[PDB]
Symmetry: D2
Amino acid sequence: CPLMVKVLDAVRGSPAINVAVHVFRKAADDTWEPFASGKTSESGELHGLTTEEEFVEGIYKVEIDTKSYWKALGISPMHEHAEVVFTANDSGPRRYTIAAMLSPYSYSTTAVVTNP
Amino acid sequence: CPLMVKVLDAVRGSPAINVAVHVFRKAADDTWEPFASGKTSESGELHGLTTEEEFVEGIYKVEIDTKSYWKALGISPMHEHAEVVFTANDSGPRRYTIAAMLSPYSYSTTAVVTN
Amino acid sequence: CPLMVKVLDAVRGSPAINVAVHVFRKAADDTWEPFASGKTSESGELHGLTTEEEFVEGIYKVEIDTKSYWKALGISPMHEHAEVVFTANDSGPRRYTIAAMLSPYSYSTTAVVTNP
Amino acid sequence: CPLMVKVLDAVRGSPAINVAVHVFRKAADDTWEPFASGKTSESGELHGLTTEEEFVEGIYKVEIDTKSYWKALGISPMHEHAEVVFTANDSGPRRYTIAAMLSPYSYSTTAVVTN
Ligand SMILES: [Zn+2]
Ligand SMILES: [Zn+2]
Ligand SMILES: [Zn+2]
Ligand SMILES: [Zn+2]
Ligand SMILES: [Zn+2]
Ligand SMILES: [Zn+2]
Ligand SMILES: [Zn+2]
Ligand SMILES: [Zn+2]
Ligand SMILES: [Zn+2]
Ligand SMILES: [Zn+2]
Ligand SMILES: [Zn+2]
Ligand SMILES: [Zn+2]
Ligand SMILES: [Zn+2]
Ligand SMILES: [Zn+2]
Ligand SMILES: [Zn+2]
């Protein structure tokens, strides 16, 4: 996959499963244009989002739905999404894994970028 | 402070000092409206961004400029900013510290919400 | 303080308050010698652990008690402590703030080292 | 694998490849007894460390060698190792992935426990 997203639940020590992910690309008018979406698998991963030929150099935003994810805990999170913005392919095509460790009021987002 | 931003440099083990921070609020048309701005202090902290008159419930973005912060390392980072979006005051007036521990290809963040 | 420890609760979005912290220094027999301890304040901070005189060059471990912190939560954490080992003052005195953002199955430990 | 270790480099945005990992288990006299070891693969993963016959409930330390890892950075890190301690299996036989996301003066780690 040129772009894969992987989500892990730091509170329970598990992959975050069946979580909705939206990816946007910044367009010329500076709006975020929908680019791809899906739900994470059993392993927390969302594969098959895009193709090389769609994944052009640009600025992309990944939004992971968190509003309801934390409900059985009893906690409403800092925001309805966990978000990270990254710049892609600005030095030639690369593959990206965006890995997110999530808690209600903290997370990390790491971009693992490899030369295909 | 209703909103304070603290930025640490995870590569060097130091506050991120004199880094430009921009705060925006999501507007009615779904664009980011400029809300506040400043540079971090010697301690990595940015105080005095807003007041309760102005900081109503809504969706805010903290954007920290990182494009050249890394330059001396020799690393171009994953993006020219580090961001965090949070929803405020969804249940009354609450002081927020947004803490960001930054590296070029990973960053953590915390929202600490009190009072 | 030459050494300060600050603990944030990533699940609730708060300082972690009244949490016990232990600090050890690695002795010559390669056991961990007790060095200082305390409980964090309302800001999640623990000040006054040591003095410059006592805080000699060495390898230190900070252990933050987590076992029951996460009980009201309904979660057993990955370990009874969150722990961070660091090497101190090996290029002259420095002051250290050890900052931990904690969730039951993830945490981040950052050493902020400043030279007076 | 009953236990897998994955190591990412947050400074460069890459798996941490060919890094040495030791795993210890706390012994009866409170010292760390060597338990397993290996080097991460090109994906930053270390498989095959143990089996259920050997991986009983207890306290384990995963130690990743970092002293010279960011020497090319020009950075001496916060300690020559990055270390995570976890209590294993404490409720029956689980599979554990220990994921470490490293910078010289910070890291983010995580135990993913599945059944
Ligand atoms: Zn894939
Ligand atoms: Zn959604
Ligand atoms: Zn959002
Ligand atoms: Zn303030
Ligand atoms: Zn700017
Ligand atoms: Zn007003
Ligand atoms: Zn940006
Ligand atoms: Zn102090
Ligand atoms: Zn002295
Ligand atoms: Zn204790
Ligand atoms: Zn322990
Ligand atoms: Zn395996
Ligand atoms: Zn070794
Ligand atoms: Zn056996
Ligand atoms: Zn060590």
